[PDB]
Design a protein around this ligand. Structure first.
Ligand SMILES: *[C@@H]1O[C@H](CO)[C@@H](O)[C@H](O)[C@H]1NC(C)=O
Lengths: 49, 49
């Protein structure tokens, strides 16, 4: 995903989340929506499954 | 290094009773914890005596 990172700031770790790494070709069963906003430099994340 | 989305008491960083020297200007050492700032920059390096 990248080679290396320079001098930087703001490293945050959120709560753990489990996934399934097996991919199929069937019909979908869940829907995930995400909204990313940036007001006055302040990052916003809105989501619901 | 910079800390954000976190909280801290520097009292544990003081009662170690192992630091040979200590210097802090601009604010009193005993009344800096209640005073609130935005970000804290940590600048770590080695130097001779
Ligand atoms: C360290 O990071 C800051 C931004 O957080 C940047 O402005 C500065 O240039 C960086 N220092 C070096 C040596 O890259």
């Amino acid at each position: 995903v990248y080679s290396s990172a320079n001098n930087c700031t703001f490293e945050y770790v959120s709560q753990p989340f489990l996934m399934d790494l097996e991919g199929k070709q069937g019909n979908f069963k869940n829907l995930r929506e995400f909204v990313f906003k940036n007001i006055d430099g302040y990052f916003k994340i809105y989501s619901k499954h | 290094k910079r800390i954000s989305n976190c909280v801290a008491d520097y009292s544990v960083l003081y009662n170690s009773a192992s630091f040979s020297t200590f210097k802090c200007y601009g604010v009193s050492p005993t009344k800096l914890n209640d005073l609130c700032f935005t970000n804290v920059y940590a600048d770590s390096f080695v130097i001779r005596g």
